[PDB]
């Protein structure tokens, strides 16, 4: 039963600050990133696509370009961590992570900006 979990389902962030939101997925110690797919989206806008062990920035939505990045050092630990720098008011909303690593699941995280 592949399950994605979230340490927090809501983040309150200050304007101009940096934000890192996380989704956790099961790792079996012999991690193969060629089988892992990580997808982050906010209101139908593509943020991250980590496929075939590579971040495909060719599909990144305009606002999230050069501000959004997946922390690849955390993937081996079973953590899909999306870092968004210089947070704007338009970054407030519902985010979703869709992870596939054998099975597949998804979780929603809300972000509020002050």
């Amino acid at each position, epitope marked *: 039963a592949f399950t994605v979990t979230v340490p927090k389902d809501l983040y309150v962030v200050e304007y101009g600050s940096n934000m890192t939101i996380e989704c956790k997925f099961p790792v079996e110690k012999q991690l193969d990133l060629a089988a892992l797919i990580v997808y982050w989206e906010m209101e139908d806008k593509n943020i991250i696509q980590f496929v075939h062990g590579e971040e495909d920035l060719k599909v990144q939505h305009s606002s999230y370009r050069q501000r959004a990045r997946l922390l690849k050092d955390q993937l081996s630990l079973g953590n899909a961590a999306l870092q968004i720098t210089d947070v704007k008011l338009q970054d407030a909303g519902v985010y979703r992570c869709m992870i596939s690593y054998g099975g*597949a699941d998804y979780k929603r995280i809300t972000v509020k900006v002050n």
Partner: antibody, heavy 116, light 112 residues
Framework: EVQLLESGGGLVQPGGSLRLSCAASGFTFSSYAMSWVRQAPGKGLEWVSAISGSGGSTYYADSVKGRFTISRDNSKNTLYLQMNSLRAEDTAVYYC?????????WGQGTLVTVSS | QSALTQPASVSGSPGQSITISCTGTSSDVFRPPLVSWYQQHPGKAPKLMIYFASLRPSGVSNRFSGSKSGNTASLTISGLQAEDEADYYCSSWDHTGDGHVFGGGTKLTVLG
């Protein structure tokens, strides 16, 4: 290049048994979950069974539970479907499919005909 | 009886958009952020067109796009060509995250 070659199909009498095999190549077989998806002549796709990369976890559609067994050999890169107690309703083309977010690669299928 | 529901057929003139809808019968079978779409030509095996509701695999034409809204997933084909005539199937991961379900398929007709 990724290749999935199914074999083992043919005519089986009702209540009989058959084993299908799928030889995979062009990818690290043990890193991906694999599935068997079938399609009755002229009808739609039906998911049959899935197995994890290591072979430690197997999943079945309710229509084939207790009759079909999925297995894999991660040294010969081969996927199997052992079918027992076959029924006329199991007549279909059986596809071997690689799971990677979705079925990104499919074999060309093997026809299984259950008839007296 | 397929767990997912799509139209039996869709018809349309060439050089035009066309959308096929996918929907479920419960939450345990249909999860829109994990919807895949497949194209199947006569006598051929299915081909992955869209995965994760809107993601396009390498090799798939930019004329094929997918979207989701509420408890619905859609496949849109822009600039219809004659070669697009095929059966299209939607699929979703089940509630467990291990099994799968398929829609009953949609036969696409290019009317020109």
């Amino acid at each position: 290049e990724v290749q999935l070659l199914e074999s083992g199909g043919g005519l089986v009498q009702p209540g009989g048994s058959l084993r299908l095999s799928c030889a995979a190549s062009g990818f690290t077989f043990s890193s991906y979950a694999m599935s068997w998806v079938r399609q009755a002549p002229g009808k739609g796709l039906e998911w049959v069974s899935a197995i994890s990369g290591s072979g430690g976890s197997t999943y079945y559609a309710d229509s084939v539970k207790g009759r079909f067994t999925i297995s894999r050999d991660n040294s010969k890169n081969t996927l199997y479907l052992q079918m027992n107690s076959l029924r006329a309703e199991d007549t279909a083309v059986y596809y071997c499919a690689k799971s990677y977010g979705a079925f990104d690669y499919w074999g060309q299928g093997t026809l299984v005909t259950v008839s007296s | 009886q397929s767990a997912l529901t799509q139209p039996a057929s869709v018809s349309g003139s060439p050089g035009q958009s066309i959308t096929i809808s996918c929907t479920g019968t419960s939450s345990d079978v249909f999860r829109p952020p994990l919807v895949s779409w497949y194209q199947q030509h006569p006598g051929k095996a299915p081909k992955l067109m869209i995965y994760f509701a809107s993601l396009r695999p390498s090799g798939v034409s930019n004329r094929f796009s997918g979207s989701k809204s509420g408890n619905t997933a859609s496949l849109t084909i822009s600039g219809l060509q004659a070669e697009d005539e095929a059966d299209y199937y939607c699929s979703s991961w089940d509630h467990t995250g291990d099994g799968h379900v398929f829609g009953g398929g949609t036969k696409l007709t290019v009317l020109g």
